[PDB]
mmCIF file of C-alpha atoms and ligand atoms in Angstrom:
data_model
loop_
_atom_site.group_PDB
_atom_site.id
_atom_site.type_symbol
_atom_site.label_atom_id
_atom_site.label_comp_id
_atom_site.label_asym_id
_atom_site.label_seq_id
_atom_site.Cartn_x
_atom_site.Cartn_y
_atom_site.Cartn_z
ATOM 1 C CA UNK F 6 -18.531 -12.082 -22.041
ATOM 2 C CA UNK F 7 -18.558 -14.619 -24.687
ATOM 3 C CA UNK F 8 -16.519 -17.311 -24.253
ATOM 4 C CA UNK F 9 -16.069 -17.710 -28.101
ATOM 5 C CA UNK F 10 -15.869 -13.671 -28.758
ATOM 6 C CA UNK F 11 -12.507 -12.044 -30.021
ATOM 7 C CA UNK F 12 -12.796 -9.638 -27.548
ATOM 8 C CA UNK F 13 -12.738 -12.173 -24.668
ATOM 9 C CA UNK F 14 -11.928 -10.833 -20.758
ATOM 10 C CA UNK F 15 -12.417 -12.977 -18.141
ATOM 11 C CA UNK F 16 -12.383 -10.262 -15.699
ATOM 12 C CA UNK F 17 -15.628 -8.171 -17.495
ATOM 13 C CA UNK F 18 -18.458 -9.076 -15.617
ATOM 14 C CA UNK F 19 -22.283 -7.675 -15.690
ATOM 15 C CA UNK F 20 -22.795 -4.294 -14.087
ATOM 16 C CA UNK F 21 -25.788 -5.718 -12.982
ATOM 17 C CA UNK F 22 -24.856 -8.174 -10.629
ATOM 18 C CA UNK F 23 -23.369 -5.398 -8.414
ATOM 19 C CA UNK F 24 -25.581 -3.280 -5.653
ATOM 20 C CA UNK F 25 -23.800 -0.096 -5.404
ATOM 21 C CA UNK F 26 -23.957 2.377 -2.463
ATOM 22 C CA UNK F 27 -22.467 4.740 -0.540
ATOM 23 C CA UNK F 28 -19.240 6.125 -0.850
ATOM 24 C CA UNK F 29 -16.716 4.021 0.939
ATOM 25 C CA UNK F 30 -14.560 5.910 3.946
ATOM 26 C CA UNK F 31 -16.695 8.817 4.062
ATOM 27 C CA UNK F 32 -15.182 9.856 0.706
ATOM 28 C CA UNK F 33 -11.224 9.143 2.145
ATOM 29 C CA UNK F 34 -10.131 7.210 -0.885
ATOM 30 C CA UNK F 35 -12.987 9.287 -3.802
ATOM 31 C CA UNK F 36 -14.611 7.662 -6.253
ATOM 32 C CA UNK F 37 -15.378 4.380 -4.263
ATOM 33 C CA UNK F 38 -17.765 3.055 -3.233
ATOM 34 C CA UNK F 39 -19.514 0.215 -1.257
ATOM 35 C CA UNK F 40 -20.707 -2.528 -3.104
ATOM 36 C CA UNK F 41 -22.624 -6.001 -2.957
ATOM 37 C CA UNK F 42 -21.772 -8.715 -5.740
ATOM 38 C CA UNK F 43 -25.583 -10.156 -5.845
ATOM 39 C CA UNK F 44 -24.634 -13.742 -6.343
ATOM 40 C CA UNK F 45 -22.280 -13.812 -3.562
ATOM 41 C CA UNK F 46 -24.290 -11.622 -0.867
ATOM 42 C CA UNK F 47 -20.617 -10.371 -0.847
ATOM 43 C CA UNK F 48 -19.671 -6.907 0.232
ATOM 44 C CA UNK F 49 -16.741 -5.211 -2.287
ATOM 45 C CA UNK F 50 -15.451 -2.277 -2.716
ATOM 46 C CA UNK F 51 -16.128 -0.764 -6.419
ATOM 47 C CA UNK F 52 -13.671 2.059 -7.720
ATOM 48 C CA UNK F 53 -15.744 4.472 -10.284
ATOM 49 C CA UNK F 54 -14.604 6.470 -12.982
ATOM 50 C CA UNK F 55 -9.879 11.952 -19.487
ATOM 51 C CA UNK F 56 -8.683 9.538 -16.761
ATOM 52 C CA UNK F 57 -10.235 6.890 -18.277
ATOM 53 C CA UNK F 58 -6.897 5.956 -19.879
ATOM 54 C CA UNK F 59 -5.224 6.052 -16.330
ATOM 55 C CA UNK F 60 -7.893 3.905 -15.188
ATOM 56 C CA UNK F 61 -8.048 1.716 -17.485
ATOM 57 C CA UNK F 62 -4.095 1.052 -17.317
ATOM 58 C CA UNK F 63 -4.361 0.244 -13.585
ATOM 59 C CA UNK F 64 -6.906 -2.487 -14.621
ATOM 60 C CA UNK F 65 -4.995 -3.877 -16.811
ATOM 61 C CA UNK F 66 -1.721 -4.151 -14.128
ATOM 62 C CA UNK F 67 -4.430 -5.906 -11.624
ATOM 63 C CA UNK F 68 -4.973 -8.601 -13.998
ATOM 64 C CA UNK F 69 -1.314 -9.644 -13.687
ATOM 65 C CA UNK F 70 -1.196 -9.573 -10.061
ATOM 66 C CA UNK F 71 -2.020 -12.002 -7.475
ATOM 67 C CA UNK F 72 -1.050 -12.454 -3.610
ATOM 68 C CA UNK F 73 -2.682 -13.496 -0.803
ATOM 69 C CA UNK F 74 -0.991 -9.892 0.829
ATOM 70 C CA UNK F 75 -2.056 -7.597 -2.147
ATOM 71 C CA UNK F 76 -5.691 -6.244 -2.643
ATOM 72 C CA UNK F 77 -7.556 -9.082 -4.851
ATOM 73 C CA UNK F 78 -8.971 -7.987 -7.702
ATOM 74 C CA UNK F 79 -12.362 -9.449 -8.631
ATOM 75 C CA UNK F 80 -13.585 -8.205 -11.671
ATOM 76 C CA UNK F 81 -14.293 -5.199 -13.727
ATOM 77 C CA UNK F 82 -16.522 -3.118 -16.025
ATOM 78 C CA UNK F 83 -14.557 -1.486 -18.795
ATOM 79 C CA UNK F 84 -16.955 -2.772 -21.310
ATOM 80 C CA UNK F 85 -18.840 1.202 -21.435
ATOM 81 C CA UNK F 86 -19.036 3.487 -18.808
ATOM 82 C CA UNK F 87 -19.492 4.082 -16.319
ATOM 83 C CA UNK F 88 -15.807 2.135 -15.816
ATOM 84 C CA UNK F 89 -15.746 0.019 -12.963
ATOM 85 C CA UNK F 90 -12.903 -1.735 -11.297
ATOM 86 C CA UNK F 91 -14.204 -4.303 -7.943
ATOM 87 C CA UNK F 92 -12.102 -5.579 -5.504
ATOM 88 C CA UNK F 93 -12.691 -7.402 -2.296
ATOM 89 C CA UNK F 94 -13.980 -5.483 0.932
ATOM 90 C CA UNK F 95 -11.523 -5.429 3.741
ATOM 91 C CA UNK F 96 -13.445 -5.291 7.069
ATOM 92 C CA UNK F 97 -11.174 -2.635 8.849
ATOM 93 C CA UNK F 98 -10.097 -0.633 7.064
ATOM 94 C CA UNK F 99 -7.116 0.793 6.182
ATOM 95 C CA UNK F 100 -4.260 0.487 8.198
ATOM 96 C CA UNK F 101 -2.990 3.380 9.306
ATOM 97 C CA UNK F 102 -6.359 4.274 10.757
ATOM 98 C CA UNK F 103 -6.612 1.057 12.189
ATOM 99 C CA UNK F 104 -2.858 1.414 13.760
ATOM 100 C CA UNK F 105 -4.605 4.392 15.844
ATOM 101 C CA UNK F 106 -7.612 2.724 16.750
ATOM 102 C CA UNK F 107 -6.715 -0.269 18.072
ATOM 103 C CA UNK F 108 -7.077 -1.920 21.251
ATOM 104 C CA UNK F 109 -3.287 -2.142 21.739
ATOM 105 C CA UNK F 110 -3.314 -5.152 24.137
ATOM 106 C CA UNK F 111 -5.093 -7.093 21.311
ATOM 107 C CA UNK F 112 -2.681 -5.014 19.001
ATOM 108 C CA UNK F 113 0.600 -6.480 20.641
ATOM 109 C CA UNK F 114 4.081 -6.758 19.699
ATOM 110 C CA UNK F 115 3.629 -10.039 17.928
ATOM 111 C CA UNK F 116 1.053 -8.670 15.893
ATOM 112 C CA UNK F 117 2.508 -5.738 14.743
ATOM 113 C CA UNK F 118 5.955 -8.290 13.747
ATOM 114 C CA UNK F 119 3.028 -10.014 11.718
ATOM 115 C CA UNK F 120 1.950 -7.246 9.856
ATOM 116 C CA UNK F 121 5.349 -6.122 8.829
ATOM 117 C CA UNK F 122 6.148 -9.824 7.796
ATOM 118 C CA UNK F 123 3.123 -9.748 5.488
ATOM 119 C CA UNK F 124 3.803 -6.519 3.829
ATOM 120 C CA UNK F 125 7.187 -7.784 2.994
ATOM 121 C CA UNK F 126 5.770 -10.550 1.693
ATOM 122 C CA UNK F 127 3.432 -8.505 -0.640
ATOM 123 C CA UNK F 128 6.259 -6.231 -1.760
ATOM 124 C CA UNK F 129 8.509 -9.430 -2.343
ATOM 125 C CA UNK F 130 6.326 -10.193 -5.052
ATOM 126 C CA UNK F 131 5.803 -6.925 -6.051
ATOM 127 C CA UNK F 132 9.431 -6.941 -5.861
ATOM 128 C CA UNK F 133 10.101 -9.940 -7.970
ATOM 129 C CA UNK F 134 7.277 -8.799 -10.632
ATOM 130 C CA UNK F 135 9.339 -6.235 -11.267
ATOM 131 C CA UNK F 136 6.445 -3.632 -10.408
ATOM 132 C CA UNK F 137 7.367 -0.710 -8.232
ATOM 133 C CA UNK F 138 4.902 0.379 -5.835
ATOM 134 C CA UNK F 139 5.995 4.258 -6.156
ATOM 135 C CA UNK F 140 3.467 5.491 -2.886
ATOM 136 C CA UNK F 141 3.946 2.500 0.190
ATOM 137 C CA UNK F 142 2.830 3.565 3.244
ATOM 138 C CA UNK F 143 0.252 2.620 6.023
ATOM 139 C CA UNK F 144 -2.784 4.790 4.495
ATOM 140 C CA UNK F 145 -2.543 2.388 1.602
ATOM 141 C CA UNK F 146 -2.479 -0.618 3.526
ATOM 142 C CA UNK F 147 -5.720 -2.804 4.411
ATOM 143 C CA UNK F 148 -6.942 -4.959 7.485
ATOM 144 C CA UNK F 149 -9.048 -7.834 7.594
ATOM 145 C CA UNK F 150 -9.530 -10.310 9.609
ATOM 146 C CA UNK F 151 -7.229 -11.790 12.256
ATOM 147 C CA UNK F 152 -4.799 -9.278 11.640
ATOM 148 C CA UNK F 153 -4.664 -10.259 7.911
ATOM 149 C CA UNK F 154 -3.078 -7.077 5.741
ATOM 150 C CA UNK F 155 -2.927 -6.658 2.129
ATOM 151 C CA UNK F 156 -1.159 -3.567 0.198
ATOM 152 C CA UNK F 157 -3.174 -1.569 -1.875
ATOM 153 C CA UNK F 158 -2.408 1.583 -3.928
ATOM 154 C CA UNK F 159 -5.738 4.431 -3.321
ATOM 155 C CA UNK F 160 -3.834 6.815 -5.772
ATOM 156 C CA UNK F 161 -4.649 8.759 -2.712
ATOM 157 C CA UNK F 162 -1.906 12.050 -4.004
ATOM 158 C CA UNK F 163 -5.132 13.325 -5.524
ATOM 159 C CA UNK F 164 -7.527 13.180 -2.550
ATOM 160 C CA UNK F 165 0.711 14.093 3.407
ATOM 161 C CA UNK F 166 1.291 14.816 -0.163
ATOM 162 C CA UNK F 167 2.483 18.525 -1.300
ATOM 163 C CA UNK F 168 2.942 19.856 -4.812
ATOM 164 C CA UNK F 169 6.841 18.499 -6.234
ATOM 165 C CA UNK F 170 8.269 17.997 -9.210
ATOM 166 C CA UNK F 171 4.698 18.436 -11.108
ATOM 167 C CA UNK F 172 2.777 16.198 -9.477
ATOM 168 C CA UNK F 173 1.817 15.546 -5.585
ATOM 169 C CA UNK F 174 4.706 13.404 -3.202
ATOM 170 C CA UNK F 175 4.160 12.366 0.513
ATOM 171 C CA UNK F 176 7.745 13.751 1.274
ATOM 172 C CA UNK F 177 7.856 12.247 4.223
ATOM 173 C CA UNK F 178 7.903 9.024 2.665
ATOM 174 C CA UNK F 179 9.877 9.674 -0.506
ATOM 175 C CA UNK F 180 13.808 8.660 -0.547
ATOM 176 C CA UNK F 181 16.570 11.096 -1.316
ATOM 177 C CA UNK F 182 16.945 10.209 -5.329
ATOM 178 C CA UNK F 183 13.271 10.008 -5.886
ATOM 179 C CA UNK F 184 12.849 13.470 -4.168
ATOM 180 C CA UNK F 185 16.085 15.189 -5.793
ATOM 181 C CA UNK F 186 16.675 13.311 -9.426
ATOM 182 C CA UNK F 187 12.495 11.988 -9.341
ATOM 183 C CA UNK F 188 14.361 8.173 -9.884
ATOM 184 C CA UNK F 189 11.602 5.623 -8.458
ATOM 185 C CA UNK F 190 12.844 2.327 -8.158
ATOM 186 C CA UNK F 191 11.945 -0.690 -5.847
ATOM 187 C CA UNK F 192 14.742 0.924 -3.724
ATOM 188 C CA UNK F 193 12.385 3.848 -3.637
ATOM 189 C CA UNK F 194 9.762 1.059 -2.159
ATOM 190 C CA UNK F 195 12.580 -0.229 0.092
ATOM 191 C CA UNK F 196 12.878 3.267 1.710
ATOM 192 C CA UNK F 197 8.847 3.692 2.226
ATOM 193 C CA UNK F 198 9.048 0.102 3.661
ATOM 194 C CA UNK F 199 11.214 1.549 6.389
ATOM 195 C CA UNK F 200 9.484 4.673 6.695
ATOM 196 C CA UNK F 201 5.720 2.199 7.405
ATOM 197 C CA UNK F 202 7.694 0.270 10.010
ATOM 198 C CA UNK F 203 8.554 3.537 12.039
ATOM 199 C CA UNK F 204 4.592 3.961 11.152
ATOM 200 C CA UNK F 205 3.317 0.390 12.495
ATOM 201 C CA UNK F 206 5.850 0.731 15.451
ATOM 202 C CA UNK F 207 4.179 3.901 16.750
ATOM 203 C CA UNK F 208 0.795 2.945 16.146
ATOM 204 C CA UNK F 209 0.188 5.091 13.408
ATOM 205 C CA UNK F 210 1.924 8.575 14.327
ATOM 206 C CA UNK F 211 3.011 10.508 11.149
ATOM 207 C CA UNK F 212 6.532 10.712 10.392
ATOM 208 C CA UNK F 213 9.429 13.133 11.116
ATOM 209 C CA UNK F 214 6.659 15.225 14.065
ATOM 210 C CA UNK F 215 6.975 18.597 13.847
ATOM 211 C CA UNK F 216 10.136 18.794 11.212
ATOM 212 C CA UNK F 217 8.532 20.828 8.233
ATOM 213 C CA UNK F 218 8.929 19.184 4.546
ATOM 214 C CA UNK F 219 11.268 21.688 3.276
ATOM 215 C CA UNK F 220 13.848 20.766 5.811
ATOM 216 C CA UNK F 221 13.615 16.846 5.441
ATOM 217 C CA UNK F 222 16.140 16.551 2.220
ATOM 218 C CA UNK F 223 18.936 18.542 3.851
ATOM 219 C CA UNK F 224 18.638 16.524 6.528
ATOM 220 C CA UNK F 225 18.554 12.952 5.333
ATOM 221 C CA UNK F 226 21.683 14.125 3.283
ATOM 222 C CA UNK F 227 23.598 15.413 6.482
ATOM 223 C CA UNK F 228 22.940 11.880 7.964
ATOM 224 C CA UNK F 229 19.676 12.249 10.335
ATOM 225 C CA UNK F 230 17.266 9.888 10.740
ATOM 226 C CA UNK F 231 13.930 9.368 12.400
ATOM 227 C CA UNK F 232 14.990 7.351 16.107
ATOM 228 C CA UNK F 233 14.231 4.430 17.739
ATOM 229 C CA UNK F 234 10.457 4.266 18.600
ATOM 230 C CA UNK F 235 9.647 3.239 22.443
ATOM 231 C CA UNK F 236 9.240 -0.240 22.352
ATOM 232 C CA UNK F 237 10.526 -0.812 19.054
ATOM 233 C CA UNK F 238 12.614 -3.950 18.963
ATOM 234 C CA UNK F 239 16.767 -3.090 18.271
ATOM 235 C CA UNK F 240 16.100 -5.812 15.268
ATOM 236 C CA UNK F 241 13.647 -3.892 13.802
ATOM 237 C CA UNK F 242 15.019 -0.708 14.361
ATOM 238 C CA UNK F 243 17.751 -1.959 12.900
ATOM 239 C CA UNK F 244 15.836 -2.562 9.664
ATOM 240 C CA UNK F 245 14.434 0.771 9.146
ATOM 241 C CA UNK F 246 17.593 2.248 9.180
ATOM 242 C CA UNK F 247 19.424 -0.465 6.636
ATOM 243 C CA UNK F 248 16.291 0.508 4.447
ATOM 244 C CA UNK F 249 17.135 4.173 4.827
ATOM 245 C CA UNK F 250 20.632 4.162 3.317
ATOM 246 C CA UNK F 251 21.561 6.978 1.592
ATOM 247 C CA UNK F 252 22.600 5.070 -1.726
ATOM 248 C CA UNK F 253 19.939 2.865 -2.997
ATOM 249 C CA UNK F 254 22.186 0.014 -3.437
ATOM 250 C CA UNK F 255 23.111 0.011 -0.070
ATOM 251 C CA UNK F 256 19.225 -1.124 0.586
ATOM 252 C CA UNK F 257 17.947 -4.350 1.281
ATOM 253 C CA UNK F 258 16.311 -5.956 -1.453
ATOM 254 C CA UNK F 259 12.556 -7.105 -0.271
ATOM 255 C CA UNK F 260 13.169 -10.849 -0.430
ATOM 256 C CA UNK F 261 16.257 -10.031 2.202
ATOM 257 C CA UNK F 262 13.264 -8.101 4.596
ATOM 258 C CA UNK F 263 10.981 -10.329 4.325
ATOM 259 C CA UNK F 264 13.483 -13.546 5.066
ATOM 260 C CA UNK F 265 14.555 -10.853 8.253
ATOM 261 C CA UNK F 266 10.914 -10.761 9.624
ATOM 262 C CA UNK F 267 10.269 -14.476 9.266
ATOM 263 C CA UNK F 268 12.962 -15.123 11.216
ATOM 264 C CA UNK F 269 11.598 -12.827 14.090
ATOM 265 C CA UNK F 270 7.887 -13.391 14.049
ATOM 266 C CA UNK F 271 8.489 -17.467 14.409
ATOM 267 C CA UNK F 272 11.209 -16.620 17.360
ATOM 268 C CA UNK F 273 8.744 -14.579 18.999
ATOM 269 C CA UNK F 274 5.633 -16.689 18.342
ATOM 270 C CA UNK F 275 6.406 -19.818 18.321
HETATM 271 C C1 LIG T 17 -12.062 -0.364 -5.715
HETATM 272 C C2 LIG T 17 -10.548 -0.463 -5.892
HETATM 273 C C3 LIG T 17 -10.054 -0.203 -7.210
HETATM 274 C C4 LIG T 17 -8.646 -0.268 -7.475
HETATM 275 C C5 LIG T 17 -7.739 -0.589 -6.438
HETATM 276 N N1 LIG T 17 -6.341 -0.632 -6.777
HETATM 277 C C6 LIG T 17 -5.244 -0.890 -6.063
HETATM 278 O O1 LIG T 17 -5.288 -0.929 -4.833
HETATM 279 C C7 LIG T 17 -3.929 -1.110 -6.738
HETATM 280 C C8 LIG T 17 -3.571 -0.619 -8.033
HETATM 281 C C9 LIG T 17 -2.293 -0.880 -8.573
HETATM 282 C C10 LIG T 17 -1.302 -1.649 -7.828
HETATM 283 C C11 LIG T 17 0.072 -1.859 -8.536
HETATM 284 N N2 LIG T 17 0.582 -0.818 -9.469
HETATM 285 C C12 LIG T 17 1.755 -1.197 -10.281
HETATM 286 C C13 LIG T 17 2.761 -0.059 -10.076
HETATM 287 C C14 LIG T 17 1.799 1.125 -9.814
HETATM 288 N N3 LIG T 17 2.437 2.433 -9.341
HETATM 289 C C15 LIG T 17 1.366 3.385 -8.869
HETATM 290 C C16 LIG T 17 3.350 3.097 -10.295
HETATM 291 C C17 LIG T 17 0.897 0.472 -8.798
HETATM 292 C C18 LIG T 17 -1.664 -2.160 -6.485
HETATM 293 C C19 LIG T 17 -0.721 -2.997 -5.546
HETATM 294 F F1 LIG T 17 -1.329 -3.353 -4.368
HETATM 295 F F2 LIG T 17 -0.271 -4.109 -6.180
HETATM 296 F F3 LIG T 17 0.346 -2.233 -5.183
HETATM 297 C C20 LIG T 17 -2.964 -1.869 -6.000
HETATM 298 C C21 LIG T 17 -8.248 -0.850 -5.107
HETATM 299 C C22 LIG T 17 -9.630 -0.784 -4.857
HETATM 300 N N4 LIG T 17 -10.066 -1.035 -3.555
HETATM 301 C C23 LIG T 17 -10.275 -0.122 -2.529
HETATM 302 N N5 LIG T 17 -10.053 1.167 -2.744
HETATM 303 C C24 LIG T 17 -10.269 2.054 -1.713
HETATM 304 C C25 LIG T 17 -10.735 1.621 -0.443
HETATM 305 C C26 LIG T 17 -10.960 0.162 -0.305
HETATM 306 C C27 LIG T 17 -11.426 -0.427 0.877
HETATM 307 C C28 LIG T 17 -11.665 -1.885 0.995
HETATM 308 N N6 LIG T 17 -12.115 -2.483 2.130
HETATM 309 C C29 LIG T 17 -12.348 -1.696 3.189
HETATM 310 N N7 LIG T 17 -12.181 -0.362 3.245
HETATM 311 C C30 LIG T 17 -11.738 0.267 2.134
HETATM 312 N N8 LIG T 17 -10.714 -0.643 -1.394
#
């Protein structure tokens, strides 16, 4: 793009210098695919494309966010279609699938403490940006290397999540007044938060086993809640259930979590 032009965008860059090919995941997360940016011999992943106004919306909210635990936007091709939006390639994975494949001794207690503290960290600033995240959960988490994880958001409801109020909600991971009164808030994110910890500290099983959706609401409001994972630390335990409080207020703000995992990762690594 021209430097001088009204129409200036930094993040436009030239189809061209990107090698698509094939889908990425086996077709998991859609339209994506595998991609090499030419004049990097770099490997990224390249989300394709009336959604266009959807799409081109999300674009626009990567632009204004940056964190070294949130997926990194590199550039895009919104210029004519077909639209493009690249981001960098995480080696992994996603996380959830990771959780379950794992070689568990590598995979240790201190590692999953770290992953937790970085996805605070992420929703901190998500937190502070006043974005909400409105679908956290491991599935739309990534892995690199050394145990690095960033957030991500797959839009993954249109590719877990079953029809509610109009649209498609992973009950399992949707708080009381989003599911009831559809009110997302950061809260909302505070509540998945705790619902990904029970997910990290069980190596990826899926929430609430066996209890059908249509029985989860009643129960949250009658007071029950998921239990203690084996080998999941009282601390953290104890974290999950301050981020499942009934009343959203009552809820931790992010910058409290994340302060709470420091805390726990340096006294258990050292
Ligand atoms: C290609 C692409 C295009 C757009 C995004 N967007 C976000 O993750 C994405 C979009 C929007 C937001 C934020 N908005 C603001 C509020 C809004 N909600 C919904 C109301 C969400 C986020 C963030 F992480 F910040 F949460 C991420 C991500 C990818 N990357 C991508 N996609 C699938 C699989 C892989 C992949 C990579 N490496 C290895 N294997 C797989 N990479």
């Amino acid at each position: 793009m021209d430097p001088s032009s009204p129409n200036y965008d930094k993040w436009e860059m030239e189809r061209t210098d990107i090698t698509m090919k094939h889908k990425l995941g086996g077709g998991q997360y859609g339209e994506v695919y595998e991609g090499v940016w030419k004049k990097y011999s770099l490997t990224v992943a390249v989300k394709t494309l009336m959604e266009v106004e959807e799409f081109l919306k999300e674009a626009a909210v990567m632009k204004e966010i940056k964190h070294p635990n949130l997926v990194q936007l590199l550039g895009v091709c919104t210029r004519e279609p077909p639209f493009y939006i690249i981001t960098e390639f995480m080696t992994y994975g996603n996380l959830l699938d990771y959780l379950r494949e794992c070689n568990r001794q590598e995979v240790n207690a201190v590692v999953l403490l770290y992953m937790a503290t970085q996805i605070s960290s992420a929703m901190e600033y998500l937190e502070k940006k006043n974005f909400i995240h409105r679908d956290l959960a491991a599935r739309n988490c990534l892995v690199g290397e050394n145990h690095l994880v960033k957030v991500a958001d797959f839009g993954l409801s249109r590719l877990t999540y079953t029809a509610h109020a109009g649209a498609k909600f992973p009950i399992k991971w949707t708080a009381p007044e989003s599911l009831a009164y559809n009110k997302f808030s950061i809260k909302s994110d505070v509540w998945a938060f705790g619902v990904l910890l029970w997910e990290i500290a069980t190596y990826g099983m899926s929430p609430y086993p066996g209890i059908d959706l249509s029985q989860v609401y009643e129960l949250l409001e009658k007071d029950y809640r998921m239990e203690r994972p084996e080998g999941c630390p009282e601390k953290v335990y104890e974290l999950m259930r301050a981020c499942w409080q009934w009343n959203p207020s009552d809820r931790p703000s992010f910058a409290e979590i994340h302060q709470a995992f420091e805390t726990m990762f340096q006294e258990s690594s050292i």
